[PDB]
Amino acid sequence: EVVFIVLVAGSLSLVTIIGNILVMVSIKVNRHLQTVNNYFLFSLACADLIIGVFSMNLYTLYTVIGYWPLGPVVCDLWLALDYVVSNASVMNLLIISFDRYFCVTKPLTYPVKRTTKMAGMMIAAAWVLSFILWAPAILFWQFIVGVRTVEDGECYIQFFSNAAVTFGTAIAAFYLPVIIMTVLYWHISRASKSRIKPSREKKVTRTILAILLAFIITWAPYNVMVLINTFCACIPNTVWTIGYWLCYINSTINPACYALCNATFKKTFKHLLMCH
Amino acid sequence: ASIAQARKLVEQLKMEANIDRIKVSKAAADLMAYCEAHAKEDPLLTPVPASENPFR
Amino acid sequence: ELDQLRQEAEQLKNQIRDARKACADATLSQITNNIDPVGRIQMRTRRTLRGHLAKIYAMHWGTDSRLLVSASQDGKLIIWDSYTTNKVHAIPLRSSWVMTCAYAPSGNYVACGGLDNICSIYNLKTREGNVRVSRELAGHTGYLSCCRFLDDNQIVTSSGDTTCALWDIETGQQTTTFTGHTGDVMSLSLAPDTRLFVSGACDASAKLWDVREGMCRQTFTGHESDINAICFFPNGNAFATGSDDATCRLFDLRADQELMTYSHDNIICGITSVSFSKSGRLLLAGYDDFNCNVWDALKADRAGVLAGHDNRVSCLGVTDDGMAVATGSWDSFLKIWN
Amino acid sequence: TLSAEDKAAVERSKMIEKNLKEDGISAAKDVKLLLLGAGESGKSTIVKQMKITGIVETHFTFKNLHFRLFDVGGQRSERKKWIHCFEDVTAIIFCVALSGYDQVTNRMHESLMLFDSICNNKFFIDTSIILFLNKKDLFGEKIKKSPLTICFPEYTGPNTYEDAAAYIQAQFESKNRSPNKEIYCHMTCATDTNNIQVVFDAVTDIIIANNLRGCGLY
Amino acid sequence: DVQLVESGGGLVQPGGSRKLSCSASGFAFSSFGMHWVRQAPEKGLEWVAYISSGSGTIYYADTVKGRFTISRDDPKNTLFLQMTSLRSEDTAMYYCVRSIYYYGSSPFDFWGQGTTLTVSSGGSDIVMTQATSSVPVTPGESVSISCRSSKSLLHSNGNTYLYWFLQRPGQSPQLLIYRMSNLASGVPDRFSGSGSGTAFTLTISRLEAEDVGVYYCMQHLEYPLTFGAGTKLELK
Ligand SMILES: CC(=O)OCC[N+](C)(C)C
């Protein structure tokens, strides 16, 4: 029964890697795809790639053994890298929502006002924000007077039994993006309908809810457990692990929700598959 | 008037219909001879080594 | 009267047809049945000249096989350096609607045409260090499609009004005019001897003029749609015409007949450009099915493909020594192949 | 490095690359339009209503938007050879005169044929077409004496202004088969400045649609 | 017309400072590169500074770096060079030249006029040497000159970087041959260039009386740029 667990992992991880390589070559390949709106998709592709091949493989090697293979010191670096890259992907989604909103609502001024430098600044800000948020605490909390409380076998950040700096980081990192993107996409849907006059607004709404539900369903349960354990230890080893995988899956859905919908990107893959 | 245009057209036809011509076989043979005779300095049919390829 | 003129024209056409039928004895494959093939031709891109911002409509090699000019509807006409993918000049144009460009054999001047009846001539060796318009030629009433220099002092142009003209740049006037076509003209190719030239019309015909007397010499009507590109065989006694009906022809002057036709069933697009190679064995072409095609010129056999372009190719030239070939398509990129 | 005095040419190359980049950025902010029509279609009235041989490129500005109207009808040749130069235009201004009770074949038949030809072209699958109906006063005056059946045998109904105008508009509009591009219709007759604001509104709607399609949200 | 003229010379106390301006007109100043070539009262030429188009790269001499600075203001087509803490070995007039650089261009195709500058008293770089600074010649015969360097000038590009010059008595120097093989514009079809690696020669045939002066040789492989002692030619 062990192969059943590893087959799903391998497939999802690889499907992520090949799709994102295709996307990465897809932008440079098409002259128009060299637009400023696609630097954000480069950022997202790199983020989902990193957590895709290295992190999936690691948790999976690790999923059933229950024994830390590389020891305590290495496991902390793995946790820091995983959390940083996942946060970075979430910030990429947030900035894509932002520039989509500004492009739709102000189609005349905003698309020309911003340049490539602004996109680079936004990407750098998102990445450094991810580092500032996650990298310090995970590494340094062992260096507060307490001894590594983590038992050797288990490589879990002890920051999750900590003093409500767990609630703060959770509420920020997940609740703020969800609310912000929901409020922003509601305005996008409202502004999408024609003023000079199925339809357009219905399709836009039907894409917006697709994206929003695809994001929310995966990431909600883990935050639910995060908010429960701090106060009280129901903790099935049945779903703690799937609780984490419902988080790593958003990377695989991310290429389709953001480059399948686009017509130009979909047509680009046809040429890439041709003459291969 | 169409009469003048037709007269010019027939005059041009008569002028261009009085040119000496050869056999197509000799023309094809001459094309073959030219293609074969200048084939040693064609760096597309015969690839040239990178020692003297400025684009490599 | 009208009946007499019609009878004379019919008799002349029947005599020409009978003479052409009699002069033909055998096809070219029989004489070239013992000719060795060339085999698969693997050509890979060497440089990618990523400088433009719109669709490229024309290009022309220099004279020393190094310098290169590309004209595109982004509004510019920039001179390249092929050996080191470098840029040496950038000329802003007046009208962005450009369909042709040229390079003087001396390298001193360049000329651009367009869709506004005007073939402007530029200067490259000024004492102030800038490129600047010298004289503008405006005598046509259609749209120019091709312009080839004769020397530094005179140019030949072809415009979409069934006329082709020769210009004297020193004065700026139109010296000689050519007429006889029925539809638009879209191609022009100066002969190596610079004494006569060909011009393919949109009404599926091609005629041979000379630059000394101004009268049409021959005409070759056996081809079924508008012609988009012509270029001579290096010998100066043949030329290939590339139309829109998926086929390209190869004509001969003294034989005064069509010699070969190059097609396959799977090909359904139209030619866009035609060139040759230095030995006159390799025929190149530019197709609308998003790629290029290297054509054997003596066996009519598909013998290689220069695939790699993202959109339709619209220009194709080879160097003066056959060392490289360049292609530009409706995406802003140029390519160099060996 | 291996470069000697070639470092002084790379600087020139980068300088002109920057020049081209800035020029493209500055020249990508002007919306380009095309104007078609037919003989005595009233397009002169609207091209001369815009207040600031070959292509008469007309330029003007409105609400800080650089406009470019490429009137091209002056060409005299086979049309299909040069339209592809005008690809990637933002819209097409199409003018039809509502005095289609005359022969030159019937004029409205010619306009229908031309609209069908230029509306299903391979280049303009995604190019929205703005439709102007001109000379509404003349058509309304003429419909009092002569009915619409004098040119359309298939038409049935009354002989009133509004219904006939709606029928003509439906006949022109039902000629598009692609589901991406949209057709905007209007009716004017030597009227006030209204001829420019409708164009501005249509351009804004087309730009919004293009942004939605490009962002992948569409 | 192309015109170069310089102003700002005179006299200055030891350790003083002064400004010099190379005002230019008649060409696209903002797309060129400017040098400064000073000349001692009896010696040859020495290269002083350099500034490219857009003021991207600036080079300096070996006895000048750290004291002088060079800047240009191309909106007002005027060049500048700030000289501070002068020395008694700087008592030389300064020049100003034209150095467009691209594929096939001809650098040093024009030369300024020269402003006097008198101050009262109080190893790894390429070295180029010439045979003799005094050779008398006669009209009607063909004469040759040589300028041997110390480092091979045939770059891997296939190009050789060496520039022959000519200085008529009491006037500005002129360009004759660039890259040791090409003939500049305006200079007659009389002169000719040759050489290989480090032994270079310039050939003159059917010599006239207008070709009297001193000929200078220059390298352009890598900065700094070095000249020669020259060779004086006199009638009879
Ligand atoms: C960054 C974050 O809070 O979620 C990441 C969850 N995990 C560990 C499964 C990636």
XYZ file of N, CA and C in Angstrom, chain A residues 117-224:
324
model
N 10.414 48.318 -14.408
C 11.039 48.571 -13.115
C 10.037 48.416 -11.978
N 8.798 48.869 -12.187
C 7.771 48.709 -11.161
C 7.471 47.237 -10.903
N 7.406 46.429 -11.965
C 7.182 44.998 -11.788
C 8.331 44.350 -11.027
N 9.569 44.712 -11.371
C 10.709 44.184 -10.638
C 10.678 44.574 -9.174
N 10.293 45.821 -8.895
C 10.183 46.282 -7.516
C 9.122 45.493 -6.759
N 7.972 45.251 -7.394
C 6.912 44.485 -6.741
C 7.362 43.058 -6.448
N 8.031 42.422 -7.412
C 8.512 41.057 -7.207
C 9.522 41.008 -6.067
N 10.469 41.950 -6.061
C 11.464 41.987 -4.998
C 10.804 42.207 -3.645
N 9.812 43.099 -3.589
C 9.115 43.356 -2.336
C 8.407 42.105 -1.835
N 7.737 41.379 -2.731
C 7.048 40.156 -2.328
C 8.029 39.127 -1.777
N 9.140 38.914 -2.486
C 10.098 37.903 -2.045
C 10.731 38.276 -0.707
N 11.181 39.527 -0.570
C 11.824 39.932 0.677
C 10.818 39.928 1.820
N 9.543 40.201 1.526
C 8.521 40.091 2.559
C 8.366 38.650 3.019
N 8.407 37.701 2.081
C 8.348 36.292 2.463
C 9.521 35.916 3.364
N 10.735 36.333 2.986
C 11.894 36.055 3.837
C 11.736 36.680 5.215
N 11.386 37.968 5.273
C 11.263 38.661 6.556
C 10.235 37.961 7.435
N 9.149 37.485 6.825
C 8.088 36.854 7.597
C 8.531 35.511 8.165
N 9.152 34.664 7.337
C 9.304 33.266 7.741
C 10.719 32.939 8.210
N 11.741 33.415 7.486
C 13.108 32.973 7.766
C 13.566 33.260 9.194
N 13.365 34.468 9.770
C 13.938 34.737 11.097
C 13.472 33.789 12.191
N 12.161 33.734 12.424
C 11.602 33.069 13.595
C 11.923 31.581 13.632
N 11.775 30.898 12.496
C 11.964 29.451 12.467
C 13.376 29.090 12.910
N 14.369 29.827 12.410
C 15.753 29.528 12.759
C 16.097 30.006 14.165
N 15.579 31.167 14.568
C 16.051 31.816 15.784
C 15.305 31.395 17.042
N 14.136 30.761 16.923
C 13.378 30.428 18.125
C 14.082 29.349 18.938
N 14.883 28.509 18.278
C 15.685 27.531 19.004
C 16.702 28.212 19.907
N 17.072 29.443 19.480
C 18.102 30.278 20.170
C 17.499 31.184 21.237
N 16.196 31.095 21.445
C 15.658 31.748 22.641
C 16.131 30.729 23.666
N 16.039 30.982 24.959
C 16.688 30.059 25.946
C 16.235 28.600 25.821
N 15.018 28.339 25.379
C 14.527 26.952 25.384
C 15.331 25.993 24.533
N 15.507 24.767 25.023
C 16.199 23.707 24.242
C 15.286 23.302 23.088
N 15.876 22.949 21.930
C 15.071 22.419 20.793
C 14.040 21.509 21.445
N 12.762 21.860 21.341
C 11.758 21.129 22.146
C 11.457 19.992 21.187
N 11.610 20.231 19.885
C 11.182 19.205 18.890
C 11.860 17.882 19.224
N 11.081 16.808 19.201
C 11.664 15.475 19.441
C 12.491 15.199 18.183
N 13.488 14.315 18.236
C 14.380 14.142 17.069
C 13.594 13.667 15.846
N 12.856 12.578 15.971
C 12.158 11.965 14.852
C 11.371 12.953 14.011
N 10.681 13.889 14.656
C 9.727 14.764 13.984
C 10.360 16.115 13.678
N 10.338 16.499 12.403
C 10.843 17.802 11.966
C 9.679 18.768 11.742
N 9.136 19.233 12.872
C 8.051 20.242 12.833
C 8.577 21.484 13.559
N 8.275 22.673 13.045
C 8.682 23.951 13.687
C 7.989 24.028 15.036
N 8.714 24.396 16.082
C 8.111 24.356 17.429
C 7.334 25.642 17.570
N 7.470 26.526 16.572
C 6.786 27.846 16.583
C 5.272 27.650 16.667
N 4.798 26.445 16.354
C 3.335 26.159 16.371
C 2.815 25.795 17.746
N 3.675 25.711 18.736
C 3.135 25.498 20.097
C 3.414 26.796 20.828
N 3.845 27.805 20.067
C 4.313 29.049 20.715
C 3.241 30.003 21.211
N 3.679 31.203 21.607
C 2.792 32.167 22.285
C 2.025 33.091 21.352
N 1.095 32.575 20.554
C 0.170 33.431 19.772
C 0.902 34.231 18.708
N 2.185 33.976 18.524
C 2.842 34.647 17.384
C 2.556 33.641 16.303
N 1.705 32.680 16.631
C 1.319 31.695 15.627
C 0.020 32.234 15.041
N -0.866 32.743 15.903
C -2.095 33.358 15.414
C -1.800 34.554 14.526
N -0.847 35.397 14.925
C -0.525 36.562 14.117
C -0.024 36.191 12.734
N 0.939 35.268 12.670
C 1.480 34.888 11.371
C 0.430 34.186 10.520
N -0.400 33.333 11.129
C -1.445 32.663 10.363
C -2.449 33.668 9.819
N -2.977 34.532 10.694
C -4.012 35.471 10.279
C -3.490 36.356 9.162
N -2.284 36.910 9.322
C -1.715 37.686 8.231
C -1.618 36.837 6.970
N -0.737 35.832 6.998
C -0.264 35.182 5.781
C -1.399 34.546 4.990
N -2.464 34.102 5.665
C -3.547 33.502 4.890
C -4.786 34.387 4.862
N -5.268 34.830 6.026
C -6.534 35.549 6.053
C -6.449 36.857 5.277
N -5.330 37.595 5.385
C -5.274 38.874 4.680
C -5.330 38.698 3.168
N -4.531 37.824 2.540
C -4.664 37.654 1.083
C -6.047 37.215 0.635
N -6.702 36.320 1.376
C -8.009 35.828 0.949
C -9.023 36.965 0.922
N -9.096 37.730 2.011
C -10.043 38.837 2.081
C -9.719 39.885 1.026
N -8.433 40.216 0.871
C -8.046 41.249 -0.086
C -8.437 40.839 -1.501
N -8.116 39.602 -1.886
C -8.426 39.153 -3.239
C -9.928 39.040 -3.462
N -10.682 38.615 -2.445
C -12.132 38.548 -2.599
C -12.721 39.931 -2.845
N -12.342 40.903 -2.011
C -12.869 42.256 -2.161
C -12.447 42.841 -3.504
N -11.224 42.536 -3.938
C -10.718 43.106 -5.179
C -11.414 42.503 -6.397
N -11.586 41.184 -6.417
C -12.297 40.527 -7.501
C -13.776 40.869 -7.549
N -14.399 41.214 -6.420
C -15.782 41.678 -6.504
C -15.865 42.969 -7.311
N -14.945 43.905 -7.056
C -14.880 45.132 -7.844
C -14.551 44.843 -9.302
N -13.649 43.890 -9.553
C -13.344 43.529 -10.936
C -14.587 43.015 -11.647
N -15.353 42.142 -10.992
C -16.570 41.609 -11.593
C -17.586 42.714 -11.849
N -17.726 43.644 -10.901
C -18.666 44.745 -11.090
C -18.254 45.639 -12.254
N -16.954 45.911 -12.391
C -16.501 46.815 -13.444
C -16.411 46.110 -14.792
N -16.478 44.776 -14.798
C -16.342 44.037 -16.050
C -17.522 44.266 -16.986
N -18.722 44.532 -16.474
C -19.931 44.606 -17.353
C -19.866 45.810 -18.285
N -20.402 45.683 -19.502
C -20.350 46.777 -20.513
C -21.106 48.020 -20.056
N -20.545 49.205 -20.317
C -21.227 50.481 -19.972
C -21.814 51.076 -21.259
N -21.214 50.762 -22.411
C -21.702 51.271 -23.738
C -22.600 50.222 -24.381
N -23.911 50.431 -24.317
C -24.865 49.451 -24.883
C -26.265 50.064 -24.850
N -23.266 33.588 -23.890
C -23.794 34.222 -22.677
C -23.553 35.725 -22.660
N -22.456 36.136 -22.028
C -22.103 37.546 -21.921
C -20.644 37.682 -21.506
N -20.227 38.891 -21.145
C -18.885 39.133 -20.634
C -18.813 39.030 -19.119
N -19.704 39.731 -18.412
C -19.655 39.747 -16.956
C -19.876 38.356 -16.381
N -20.756 37.572 -17.003
C -21.005 36.222 -16.507
C -19.757 35.355 -16.621
N -19.047 35.445 -17.747
C -17.812 34.682 -17.899
C -16.753 35.137 -16.901
N -16.613 36.453 -16.720
C -15.638 36.967 -15.762
C -15.967 36.482 -14.358
N -17.249 36.507 -13.991
C -17.659 36.048 -12.671
C -17.388 34.558 -12.493
N -17.601 33.797 -13.590
C -17.462 32.308 -13.599
C -16.009 31.894 -13.550
N -15.087 32.726 -13.986
C -13.646 32.552 -13.814
C -13.192 32.994 -12.425
N -13.732 34.112 -11.933
C -13.324 34.626 -10.629
C -13.679 33.644 -9.522
N -14.911 33.127 -9.526
C -15.281 32.138 -8.515
C -14.490 30.846 -8.668
N -14.190 30.434 -9.902
C -13.341 29.262 -10.081
C -12.005 29.447 -9.371
N -11.337 30.574 -9.627
C -10.031 30.823 -9.018
C -10.149 30.902 -7.501
N -11.137 31.655 -7.013
C -11.245 31.890 -5.577
C -11.531 30.601 -4.821
N -12.451 29.775 -5.327
C -12.726 28.507 -4.663
C -11.536 27.562 -4.755
N -10.873 27.510 -5.916
C -9.701 26.650 -6.049
C -8.636 27.019 -5.027
N -8.496 28.312 -4.730
C -7.544 28.714 -3.699
C -8.050 28.374 -2.302
N -9.315 28.689 -2.012
C -9.792 28.643 -0.630
C -9.902 27.207 -0.134
N -10.437 26.314 -0.974
C -10.727 24.956 -0.515
C -9.453 24.261 -0.056
N -8.358 24.452 -0.792
C -7.108 23.789 -0.433
C -6.552 24.323 0.883
N -6.486 25.646 1.029
C -5.687 26.211 2.110
C -6.482 26.405 3.397
N -7.811 26.329 3.351
C -8.589 26.554 4.571
C -8.342 25.517 5.666
N -8.401 24.203 5.405
C -8.344 23.244 6.525
C -7.073 23.328 7.353
N -5.923 23.548 6.712
C -4.679 23.628 7.467
C -4.712 24.794 8.439
N -5.253 25.931 8.006
C -5.391 27.064 8.910
C -6.387 26.761 10.021
N -7.416 25.963 9.727
C -8.341 25.561 10.786
C -7.613 24.756 11.860
